[PDB]
Write a protein that binds this ligand. Structure first.
Ligand SMILES: Cc1ncc(C[n+]2c([C@](O)(CO)[C@@H](O)[C@H](O)[C@H](O)[C@H](O)COP(=O)(O)O)sc(CCOP(=O)(O)OP(=O)(O)O)c2C)c(N)n1
Ligand SMILES: Cc1ncc(C[n+]2c([C@](O)(CO)[C@@H](O)[C@H](O)[C@H](O)[C@H](O)COP(=O)(O)O)sc(CCOP(=O)(O)OP(=O)(O)O)c2C)c(N)n1
Ligand SMILES: [Mg+2]
Ligand SMILES: [Mg+2]
Ligand code: NA
Ligand code: NA
Lengths: 621, 621
């Protein structure tokens, strides 16, 4: 309604019956599959019954509806009970539940967004609460809508630090539309969870992190109804004391049963037991939401004008990123920016200054920042751009990995790439970020070499699906492109050519500029080189690279401010291996660097103008 | 001594004078460099003075001595004050401090283990406490020695979830030899830290996580002496209220000064001010430790016998890993094992059963697990083997990255690689782990294809420096190698050859077995293929690959249960690009997978025996 509807005994009995149907289905499906986690389903059965059939408001026939309450199954291995509630709600055919984990079904082992009732993939534990925080932030501050967000976690799961980043985020940002349900079933996978059934200690941890924390009997439908019924001015933690395998005689509260399906003979006996407890076959109906989520536009986002950079002027691509993102924010209210206490260094502060209501300070918590962004992007409510130093996106790789499994459209800009940052040393130097982002199967990897290309990369990323990464650079370099140069995903640029070119040199960011400097060195020796700027490292403009190489005696030289593995050189090599008369030579950083001036480190690690020149001569000779 | 020595006013004044010398040096060094973080040094100056010149026990001329107390600078950007205390202690020449961040110096921007006084590199925030936990665990349970471990953290830093994993670890494992000092200076990089000077809330969070928590004035040398002087039966958190830029008039407690050096004119004026407070030039001497750390052997670790596997028997390489690690543990007491609540699935439980005192349950907290291992490996005290699913090592990539910057010798075994796990789906499938580990510059990447190769990989890893990764596989495959087959890092094996071979097919784990099955299919069609097992993906046996390719008409086909980028195919391609008549073709997983049986998914994603056979024919034709 709006008033809590205090259930009668018959509604409570129907919720109990529902919980027991959900147990039966979880057992049937995992026994049929021969794999899965029925004991992890069974501890959560009353929680699920009460959320889906008393507390939540949602359209049962339209799970993605923007007005619906959100549910995030953070403990994703309880997928079978998620599937069972959506059957119970009438969305999914009951017979399909028995096809769990089959190649002929979309009821996969863990939830995935090919399912209409799933927004984010889980299965890597500890990430759901951060997505839920993004959904709740969006609900309260962007959509300004009445939907609530519910997130179910395991107790072993609570050992992940990412959970506590989300806990802290929710209290900083007063997410009083967010509820975390903790399934304190005492046990993890291979041993008891550290705190077991020390419910007080869970309470104290949640309260210390700013949450309103309520301990309940997690197998009492009435206590759950009551705890979920009351809204707070705080994010609320329902700390539910449960037993793993609840309702499975001789398995409840026992070790050695995580991720183990009941055999067929045992499932039959247990199901008969559970079924004997059910007092009516009649099912409860879902209740729909208040429809107050606003319309969101779906159109291409265009910069309000061309770049206003002048050739020969100098700007760092990190600063051009912030300028471009702010500019883009004037064109569209969909754009939001997130940063992890690095906004002065990534230049996302420019966006904050101009569009403060759409900036989310995420503090020094990169995992959570990525999960917030994923949650904000769900149901296309926003177009997120996250930023930090590229090196520190390695802290969030599992969140990024899961974001691609979640089919998420997020944009990530990592600054401070390579040794060219200079004096801070290797802890701040991204040397593995191309490897990392190239291995994310939905990614587009932009490596803009000047301020014009950076602005164009921001615009293209905004309109590109999947995981978009933009690699920015700390020092200043010259603008080399005209403001009206056309840029496209998968289209490189030849920035220097002559008919007498003897090598095609591929560089990007600072190494493009070093390659141009090398070309000037070499001209002194009457040696000409073609210089190619890839623009995107993934996808790579294989056609222009090969055409170029055919014009320079088959020779390619790649030079990159990155380690040898998984970067530009390996991408180029895999693209052209086998093409006759095509050779690829490679300059990159061969080991952990050290502090010094940018130019000194480019020299030390063999990727400056003199190293390029020397490599070109050796190929010729 | 052993009794707290309660300092007199003159000792207290000398500690104040010390703190002010440390401020002056931090300013001088960062002004000389033109970069660095003097304000982050200055909040910590009394803490540093008291730790190094009252509380700690260590040999000033032998920082790596195994009997010493350990100090971990988690907030690594305060490196200049670390350098200054080691000058103050007489280890480092005072003049060298002014060479901070120069390419001619080892006083780099953040601490690194080329410095004798540094065990682990920091600079990626939130990781030091986990290393410190490993050091303290080692001290209490392995070395059984009297040294204590002190770890200094920032307040912004405390937003990292990895810190809270360490907090929880320390209370689970009763690390009453560990002290965390929290520099609550109110400010992060780009804004106030979330809790600012709400000291109570920091206390409540630490206490809820099981620590004895003491709030102090962090600029009171006496309060610090007193708080550090008392041992507890708990890990102890000294929650120090400080001001960022303490002692720099007009900068103390101000925003817009993080990571900004004072200009030359301002540094002169401030230093004169600070110097006017110093009452004596006489320096305090360090006090040495009790020498009760045991001797550790340094010898090669050998398996007690050859593998006892029989050709044709079937075993999963994940199970062979656990068998091999347990076996290895009988040969050497140096071996320790760590796992993140996956021991039943990785089979590290076998080691736990046989060597329980040397197993560390790390719970569902992969970041912390890697940092524990790094800390345990410091000063060569142990030889750590960590395990989880390879997919979940992506959760710890920044810790792994930093472990290589720390020159750490740790071993990591990731199970459940590829689609061949089957029904759980992609959240559990490692498809990017070769990319990841290959990009870690000190890594050795083992991909054993049967139980014999797995045992040999465990033995070789134990004796190999750097970041060793062993990729294991969930399903069972046949033993194909004799027990006395010699294995070496960088040496592949040809497992099938004939004089009429038309393609060299490179596979590993399940795809090696699929390649053998393809060879049998193809023989029906009177087509022979050479099959090569790399053993190590990094370093790759380029010689045997090329020799093989020269025997099979220049053709190589790679097939891998991994994404296309950064894996086996790209490694091979980069190794041989340009070699005449050498062609490389590549089969890998092209997108996020889905649930099904192992064989069904190998088929769906184009990496089974029928896909290999079809690729071979197309090359021929
Ligand atoms: C980040 C992270 N780290 C560890 C784990 C592993 N894990 C879980 C999964 O992976 C399920 O999501 C396993 O259960 C996995 O399915 C196994 O493959 C399975 O058990 C079969 O083993 P086999 O050897 O045959 O392959 S769940 C889990 C414990 C969670 O405990 P909680 O207390 O949080 O939840 P509860 O179940 O409600 O009690 C672990 C360690 C994941 N997934 N993510
Ligand atoms: C995991 C992680 N995430 C973020 C950060 C960034 N960061 C710090 C570093 O990186 C220093 O280690 C910066 O300060 C870096 O040196 C900058 O390059 C520098 O500031 C210069 O900027 P430029 O734009 O010129 O390149 S420190 C830090 C704040 C820490 O606050 P705390 O309250 O914890 O510590 P305090 O200093 O004692 O108050 C951040 C966000 C890192 N390093 N790791
Ligand atoms: Mg549990
Ligand atoms: Mg601070
Ligand atoms: Na995008
Ligand atoms: Na090793």
């Amino acid at each position: 309604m709006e008033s809590y509807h205090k259930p009668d005994q018959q509604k409570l009995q129907a919720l109990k019956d529902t919980a027991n149907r959900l147990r039966i289905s979880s057992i049937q499906a995992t026994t049929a599959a021969g794999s899965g986690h029925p004991t992890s389903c069974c501890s959560a059965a009353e929680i699920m019954a009460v959320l889906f059939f008393h507390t939540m408001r949602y359209k049962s026939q339209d799970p993605r509806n923007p007005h619906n309450d959100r549910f995030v199954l953070s403990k994703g291995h309880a997928a079978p009970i998620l599937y069972a509630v959506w059957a119970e709600a009438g969305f999914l055919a009951e017979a399909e539940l028995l096809n769990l984990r089959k190649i002929s079904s979309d009821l996969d082992g863990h939830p995935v967004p090919k399912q209409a009732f799933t927004d984010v993939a889980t299965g890597s534990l500890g990430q759901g609460l951060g997505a839920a925080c993004g959904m709740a932030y969006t609900g309260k501050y962007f959509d300004k809508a009445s939907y609530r967000v519910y997130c179910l976690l395991g107790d072993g799961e609570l050992s992940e630090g990412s959970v506590w980043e989300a806990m802290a985020f929710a209290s900083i940002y007063k997410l009083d539309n967010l509820v975390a349900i903790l399934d304190i079933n005492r046990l993890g996978q291979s041993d008891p969870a550290p705190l077991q059934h020390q419910m007080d200690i869970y309470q104290k941890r949640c309260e210390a992190f700013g949450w309103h924390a309520i301990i309940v009997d997690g197998h009492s439908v009435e206590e759950l109804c009551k705890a979920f019924g009351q809204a707070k001015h705080q994010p609320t933690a329902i700390i539910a004391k449960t037993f793993k395998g609840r309702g499975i005689t001789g398995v409840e509260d026992k070790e050695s049963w995580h991720g183990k399906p009941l055999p067929k003979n045992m499932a039959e006996q247990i199901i008969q037991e559970i079924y004997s407890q059910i007092q009516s076959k009649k099912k409860i109906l879902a209740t729909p939401p208040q429809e107050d989520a606003p319309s969101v536009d779906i159109a291409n986002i265009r910069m309000p004008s061309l770049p206003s950079y002048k050739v020969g002027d100098k700007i760092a691509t990190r600063k051009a990123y912030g300028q471009a993102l702010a500019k883009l924010g004037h064109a569209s209210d969909r754009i939001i920016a997130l940063d992890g206490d690095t906004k002065n260094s990534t230049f996302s502060e420019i966006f904050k200054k101009e569009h403060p209501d759409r900036f989310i300070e995420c503090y020094i918590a990169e995992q959570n920042m990525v999960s917030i962004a994923v949650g904000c992007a769900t149901r296309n409510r926003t177009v997120p751009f996250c930023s930090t130093f590229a090196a520190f996106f390695t802290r969030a790789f599992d969140q990024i990995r899961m974001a691609a499994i979640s089919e998420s459209n997020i944009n990530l800009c990592g600054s401070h790439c390579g040794v060219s940052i200079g004096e801070d040393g290797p802890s701040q130097m991204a040397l593995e970020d191309l490897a990392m982002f190239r291995s994310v199967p939905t990614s587009t990897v932009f490596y803009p070499s000047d301020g014009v290309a950076t602005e164009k990369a921001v615009e293209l990323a905004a309109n590109t699906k999947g995981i978009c990464f933009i690699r920015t650079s700390r020092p200043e370099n010259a603008i080399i492109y005209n403001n009206n140069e056309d840029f496209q995903v998968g289209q490189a640029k030849v920035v220097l050519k002559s008919k007498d070119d003897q090598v095609t040199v591929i560089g990007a960011g600072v190494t493009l500029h070093e390659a141009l400097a090398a070309a000037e060195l070499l001209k002194k020796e009457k040696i000409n080189i073609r210089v190619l700027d890839p623009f995107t490292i993934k996808p790579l403009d294989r056609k222009l690279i090969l055409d170029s190489a055919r014009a320079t005696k088959g020779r390619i030289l790649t030079v990159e401010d990155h380690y040898y593995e998984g970067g530009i050189g390996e991408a180029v090599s895999s693209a052209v291996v086998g093409e006759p008369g095509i050779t690829v030579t490679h300059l990159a950083v061969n080991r952990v660097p050290r502090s010094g001036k940018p130019a000194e480190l480019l020299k030390m690690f063999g990727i400056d103008r003199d190293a390029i020149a020397q490599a070109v001569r050796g190929l010729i000779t």
